[PDB]
Design a protein around this ligand. Structure first.
Ligand code: ANP
Ligand code: ANP
Ligand code: LAR
Ligand code: LAR
Ligand code: NSB
Ligand code: NSB
Ligand code: CA
Ligand code: CA
Ligand code: CA
Ligand code: CA
Lengths: 342, 342
């Protein structure tokens, strides 16, 4: 009688029960044979492996029988119709869930901010999306996708620390650098100024303690790493930055709702957790938009879990109860019911 | 009967004869006891040493008897009255010149561009000035001085190459790095973009051959070095950059002539020889000025020698012949004649 909420990400699975303020279980989306990531850039690409992960969610992490709880899952924006159907098939026929639904992650994040209209920036471990949303529906022609997120940043941080004399190379060491990224990296309001402070003084330098007790210093790397979000060619990508893509996204929208989009930039996901990221987005967006445009960036403290929380909220909504797909419905109709409904 | 033109700089002496398109002699402003630079930041600070240099100019470089040629000398903008008088005293009483004059360097550069009104940027080896000029006279309340020029850049280039694995440390090696600076450095139109090209590809890398035959590669250093002109805090200076100081200089001027200043940015001196420096000044000045402002940067090809050439031109002008101070005048009046005249 309690709904489950399962948020499948490229790097982390967020799972728990609808009606809770936070997921009870957060764990890595990996299977080992060497580690495989069954979710690449927000999309499921190995189904056997994904089954093992959902099997782990039910029986190990949450400790519930799947056939007893309606289950709300999440999908990346622009997730192919065929992918969504396979997900539905696995849930009802492998796991015997009594009901389910598949929600778009970035919309859930918007709901968690107490909003139904806005433009979300959702940046995770494997993909970055700009998702314009009007009255609860994502506008698919205007969604932007950037294949650059936290894992790319971490690798970049491994590369640039190497040029300071450190040798971070192994996949175990990649975990240590992810940790440094999360404790020590921030977004410079102005990249040049920051490089010049760091060139001429030690005021931005931080110490980090390694597992074995050794202490190292990191400098301009702190902000050079997440700077790649605004200038992706730092790792050889031609794409525009997250500021430009927010702008391009808003511009693919009907002029009537663009003011509301600009006033409602919601940030979502672990890779939007960099201190200073909101002030830099404000400043960058300002520079591209018309002079009179009211620009607002909302960055909730709990935005590592926004998608999950939006799910918890939706699953609990009286209005949403009519939208669950029941096993009866599915076994009667066919995997198509996941259109004229979801 | 031929006038001499002697342009005394922090690093190089430019000397020759009025009526010529170029100085016949260019040589370093040094005395050795260890090398001393008798001119610090454009100002003469050792007089015995300066006498040796002028003695070298007359007898070794130019091969003329001083008592036979009117001699035009140059001074930094804002050169103290007392300094100018000592110069005059040495010329007439140590060297027995039959006539002389002391001209402001940055005005000469303006004249060499065929102009009497404009704002000069004069950047040498030891000092950088912004000099607003209206109808032939420098406006002293509006002159900006920056203690950052080519020698500072070269040292900075020695420091940053060291962090790439090279060890440029000795004063002999400092000459090699000055040479690299002059053959290989340029000004990025956009610093960030350039850092990102250089981080992700080898397309800005250049080879340089050392005297002993070894070949080295230099990368982002090419534009990181002269970038210090626009962002001086890269070497721990709080001053504004050459773009900001041009702006601040123009703003200390009467509103009536500011349009003419903006339309007439003349660049002068070796440190304005960086490829791309004119486009970057255009762009930076544009960003600070009002939207409607006609901005123009004039960068003559011969601007390493503009000061000298302006001197050659002035010394040859029929209008200027009344302005020479003769030895007769001086021996009659006193070193003050260098006001109600010069
Ligand atoms: N404080 C922090 N600062 C910067 N990055 C962080 C921080 N905390 C977590 N992250 C990054 O957030 C990423 C995972 O966040 P999450 O929003 O769960 O992505 P996900 O859903 O697994 N991947 P995606 O499929 O791209 O949505 C990892 O790369 C983390 O390193
Ligand atoms: N192609 C070039 N690119 C960059 N810098 C250059 C180039 N050629 C010469 N320079 C620099 O120009 C400086 C000397 O130029 P110059 O205009 O003669 O200065 P100066 O009069 O001796 N010094 P100052 O007293 O500051 O005017 C040296 O630092 C050179 O390295
Ligand atoms: C606290 C934590 C957060 C996390 O996000 O882990 C996820 C998943 C993790 C799986 C691989 C490691 C060995 C398995 C152990 C995990 C413990 C959870 C680690 O690989 C990431 O590190 C990748 C690699 S480097 C990066 O930036 N993303 C993201
Ligand atoms: C072609 C050339 C140009 C020049 O500008 O020399 C001047 C004067 C020079 C004097 C010291 C050396 C050893 C003496 C030899 C000179 C030959 C002329 C050198 O020291 C500079 O190099 C300084 C130091 S490093 C720099 O950036 N400015 C500028
Ligand atoms: C304000 N902001 C966090 C963006 C920059 C501060 C740099 S630091 O954290 O003090 O090193
Ligand atoms: C155009 N400008 C000279 C400023 C930059 C070109 C860089 S490079 O000389 O081709 O390496
Ligand atoms: Ca996610
Ligand atoms: Ca780019
Ligand atoms: Ca000079
Ligand atoms: Ca500064």
């Amino acid at each position: 009688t309690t709904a489950l909420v399962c948020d499948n990400g490229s790097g982390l699975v967020k799972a728990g029960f609808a009606g809770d303020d936070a997921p009870r279980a957060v764990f890595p989306s990996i299977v080992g044979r060497t580690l495989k990531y069954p979710i690449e850039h927000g999309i499921i690409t190995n189904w056997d492996d994904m089954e093992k992960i959902w099997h782990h969610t039910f029986y190990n992490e949450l400790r519930v029988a799947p056939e007893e709880h309606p289950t709300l899952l999440t999908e990346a924006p622009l997730n192919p119709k065929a992918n969504r159907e396979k997900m539905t098939q696995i849930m009802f026929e492998t796991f015997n869930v009594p009901a389910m639904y598949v929600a778009i992650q970035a919309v859930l994040s918007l709901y968690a901010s107490g909003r139904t209209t806005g433009i979300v920036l959702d940046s995770g471990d494997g993909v970055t999306h700009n998702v314009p949303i009007y009255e609860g529906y994502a506008l698919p022609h205007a969604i932007m996708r950037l294949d650059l997120a936290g894992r790319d940043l971490t690798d970049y941080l491994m590369k640039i620390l190497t040029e300071r004399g450190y040798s971070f190379v192994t996949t175990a060491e990649r975990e240590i650098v992810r940790d440094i990224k999360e404790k020590l990296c921030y977004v410079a309001l102005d990249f040049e100024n920051e490089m010049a402070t760091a060139a001429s003084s030690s005021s931005l330098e931080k110490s980090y303690e390694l597992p074995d007790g050794q202490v190292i210093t990191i400098g301009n790397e702190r902000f050079r790493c997440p700077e790649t979000l605004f200038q992706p060619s730092f790792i050889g990508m031609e794409s525009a930055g997250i500021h430009e893509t927010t702008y391009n996204s808003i511009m693919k929208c009907d002029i009537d709702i663009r003011k509301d989009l600009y006033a409602n930039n919601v940030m979502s996901g672990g890779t939007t957790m960099y201190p200073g990221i909101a002030d830099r987005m404000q400043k960058e967006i300002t520079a591209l938009a018309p002079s009179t445009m009211k620009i607002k960036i909302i960055a909730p403290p709990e935005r590592k879990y926004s998608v999950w929380i939006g799910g918890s909220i939706l699953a609990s909504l009286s209005t949403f109860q009519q939208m669950w797909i029941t096993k009866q419905e599915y076994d009667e109709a066919g995997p198509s019911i996941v259109h004229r409904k979801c």
